[PDB]
Design a binder for this molecule. Structure first.
Ligand SMILES: CCc1sc(C(=O)O)c(-c2ccc(-c3c(C(=O)O)sc(CC)c3C#N)cc2)c1C#N
Ligand SMILES: N[C@@H](CCC(=O)O)C(=O)O
Ligand SMILES: N[C@@H](CCC(=O)O)C(=O)O
Ligand SMILES: [Zn+2]
Ligand SMILES: [Zn+2]
Lengths: 258, 258
């Protein structure tokens, strides 16, 4: 059967083509994950349909309802067959879905408006003037919620209680907030997205300091799926054949505007 | 059943303690993988015995007999239950053993004696004054053997035919060759090992250039091992608790002496 792929509109992973209204099906979209999906499909020998996740979220479990939302929910509830997206491999997710070996490494990082007097997480934690926050429903928020590290625990205590809310619905919303806030908001997001935006006009943001953690994005499938083995082997093959490095360069740096 | 762990004497992952002569069993050893094994053993609820791989190799398949050597062989032939080592996750290996999600990232890199006029793989490939090689029976050799990237293809043509042989039996041999060759030998090895050595007396080596690729080390088990699921889940747990980061700091830069 045609494989339903869940993914997310997150630049430069998946983006609407300029002329998408004139195009159909998989041809409407472009990006790193669009190129990657085509290759995974070709190597595993399946036909597929790209679908954008309905609720626009990565995936988290409701503490009260126990229901998973986002791409993770679409796999868990059988709405999609595979997720090919910047979907972070985490323990709580690996308990309900399967991940390939990672196709990209990343860590949480700090985005500032250029000139913001912050160099580190410690810096953010030791001051009050500059607000800071995360994507409201992903792995970055969870990192802080769970961290027993002093600096990060202090940051979480501030973020969970800050008013108005320092959390954002989408990555684009976080980036826009840094850009419009005259240095008074810094955004905590994955190094991959941080480094992409740093190379986009109007070239007014910067990644500062080291990454806070180390993790990976993986291709996810419902637990027990017949696709998992082949998908994993394809990721390894594509890495070893240099495709992943090629795709990174194509979408990050070949298209740099700064 | 006490779990037989295969591993390899490779700094700073597994090393004999200074006073190892007076110690028995697992107590003889220390290092990142020693600490990791103890942590994994704790979470998965098993007792274990650390055993150094008999042939001192990571693992490769003989093209003629198709027999695997090294730690990979120990798993394949049922001589060990798990490998907890700086064992590179590769397609050919994944076809015969199982790997956890990676516990560490690395890439191939260049070690020179300080002052060697080499900045990149491209620099190495464009001269013959300075010899260069890799470890036998590991993933770095295979990388060059298979590469279609012009620079790396050219380097392999040289390496495979070079006389006397540029290949070494152990990392320690490669490092010693760099240190004694007065700038006329450069060694190709994983960034992790390169960066450790750079921070050790006599402080006469350097990592130069970027990494040539991006991959990871995983904990390996025989295909269909019951330990596989649990060990994978343990690695992710350790990562998120910051324990892996803690271990990396403990063994690389807390032990820095340069
Ligand atoms: C326990 C969770 C952690 S920790 C950690 C780390 O960097 O320490 C990583 C990590 C992420 C990615 C790579 C990697 C590749 C790339 O860096 O692009 S490529 C490729 C083969 C396909 C990779 C593997 N294996 C390696 C390690 C990780 C995960 N997942
Ligand atoms: N990649 C993250 C989303 C981005 C973030 O949390 O910063 C996830 O899978 O949840
Ligand atoms: N980590 C490598 C060994 C070292 C190397 O090849 O540079 C392996 O698993 O084969
Ligand atoms: Zn523990
Ligand atoms: Zn032979």
């Amino acid at each position: 059967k045609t494989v339903v792929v869940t993914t997310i509109l997150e630049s430069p992973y998946v983006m609407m083509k300029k002329n998408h209204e004139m195009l159909e099906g998989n041809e409407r979209y472009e990006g790193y994950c669009v190129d990657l999906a085509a290759e995974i499909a070709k190597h595993c020998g399946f036909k597929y349909k790209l679908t954008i996740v309905g609720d626009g979220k990565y995936g988290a479990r409701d503490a009260d309802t126990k229901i998973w939302n986002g791409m993770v929910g679409e796999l868990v509830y059988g709405k999609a067959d595979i997720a090919i997206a910047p979907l972070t491999i985490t323990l709580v997710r690996e308990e309900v879905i399967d991940f390939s070996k990672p196709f990209m490494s990343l860590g949480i990082s700090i985005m500032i408006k250029k000139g913001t007097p912050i160099e580190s997480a410690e810096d953010l934690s030791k001051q009050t003037e500059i607000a800071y926050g995360t994507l409201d429903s992903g792995s970055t928020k969870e990192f802080f919620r769970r961290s027993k590290i002093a600096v990060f625990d202090k940051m979480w205590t501030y973020m969970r209680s800050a008013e108005p809310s320092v959390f954002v619905r989408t990555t684009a919303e976080g980036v826009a907030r840094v850009r419009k806030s005259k240095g008074k908001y810094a955004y905590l997001l994955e190094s991959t997205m941080n480094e992409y935006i740093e190379q986009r006009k109007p070239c007014d943001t910067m990644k500062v300091g080291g990454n806070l953690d180390s993790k990976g994005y993986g291709i996810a499938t419902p637990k027990g799926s017949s696709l998992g083995n082949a998908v994993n082997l394809a990721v390894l093959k594509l890495n070893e054949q240099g495709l992943l490095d090629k795709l990174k360069n194509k979408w990050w740096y070949d298209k740099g505007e700064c």
